[PDB]
């Protein structure tokens, strides 16, 4: 599945 990856990507914000 890609749910988890999608969640982690949405929360990642290293700027």
């Amino acid at each position: 599945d890609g749910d988890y990856e999608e969640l982690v990507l949405a929360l990642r914000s290293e700027e």
Partner: antibody, heavy 116, light 113 residues
Framework: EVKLEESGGGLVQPGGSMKLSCVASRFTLSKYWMNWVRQSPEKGLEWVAQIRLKSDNYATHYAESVKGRFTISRDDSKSSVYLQMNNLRAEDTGIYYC???????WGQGTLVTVSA | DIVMTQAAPSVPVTPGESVSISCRSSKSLLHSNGNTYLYWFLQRPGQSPQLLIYRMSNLASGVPDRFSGSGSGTAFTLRISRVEAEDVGVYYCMQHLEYPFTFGAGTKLELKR
């Protein structure tokens, strides 16, 4: 379904070295930042180190108590991350957990005891 | 050097009643969005910590919907509406706004009887 599994702990002499391993199953490790966190009765939970992805040039960040002595690393093709611990101090005793990027997935932890 | 303060080392609760667990940060955890960089964890005895709440108020998947999290900048509250025995353990907050990530000292939930 995701599983992290750390190994390598045990009893070690002050000033000695020890390398911990963490192997991930059902989890494409290369996509996630990884962390080590340790636990003791003395200090509770302490974040230890972090490693980012290959495209971040594997950037690392460390706790102050551990800078210069611990090296976190990763090998995506072995689905593993590592913590090389040198010049071990008695203060480093505790349970060492590896965790994913957002702290949902944790291993069972491996116990490191530094004593003479 | 963000210090996370959990005033209460323990809290007693009558089963089926509510409880609040507080945490305080020496500095605002609001990142330049509507995002507050605060996690809540539960560590049941003899087990690894597990995530209850991310971004201060979002339930992680699989966490029972009787948990909620709230807060404003520097003061945060984890709430359980109806405590089950599933819920006994140690609750920790953690900030990841800045390196080093830092944990509160934990609040232990005890059942009344």
């Amino acid at each position: 379904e995701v599983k992290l599994e750390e190994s390598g702990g045990g009893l070690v002499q002050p000033g000695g070295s020890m390398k911990l391993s963490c192997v991930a199953s059902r989890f494409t490790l290369s996509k996630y930042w990884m962390n080590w966190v340790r636990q003791s009765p003395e200090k509770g939970l302490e974040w230890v180190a972090q490693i980012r992805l290959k495209s971040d040039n594997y950037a690392t960040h460390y706790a102050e108590s551990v800078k210069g002595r611990f090296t976190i690393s990763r090998d995506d093709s072995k689905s593993s991350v590592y913590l090389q611990m040198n010049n071990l101090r008695a203060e480093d005793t505790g349970i060492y957990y590896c965790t994913g990027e957002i702290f949902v997935n944790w291993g069972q932890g491996t116990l490191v005891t530094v004593s003479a | 050097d963000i210090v996370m303060t959990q005033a209460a080392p323990s809290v007693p609760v009558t089963p089926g009643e509510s409880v609040s667990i507080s945490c305080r940060s020496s500095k605002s955890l609001l990142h330049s969005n509507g995002n507050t960089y605060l996690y809540w964890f539960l560590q049941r005895p003899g087990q690894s910590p597990q995530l209850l709440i991310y971004r201060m108020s979002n339930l992680a998947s699989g966490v029972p919907d009787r948990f909620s999290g709230s807060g404003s900048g520097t003061a945060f509250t984890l709430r359980i509406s109806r405590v089950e025995a599933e819920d006994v353990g140690v609750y920790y907050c953690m900030q990841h706004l800045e390196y080093p990530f830092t944990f509160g000292a934990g609040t232990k939930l005890e059942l009344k009887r």
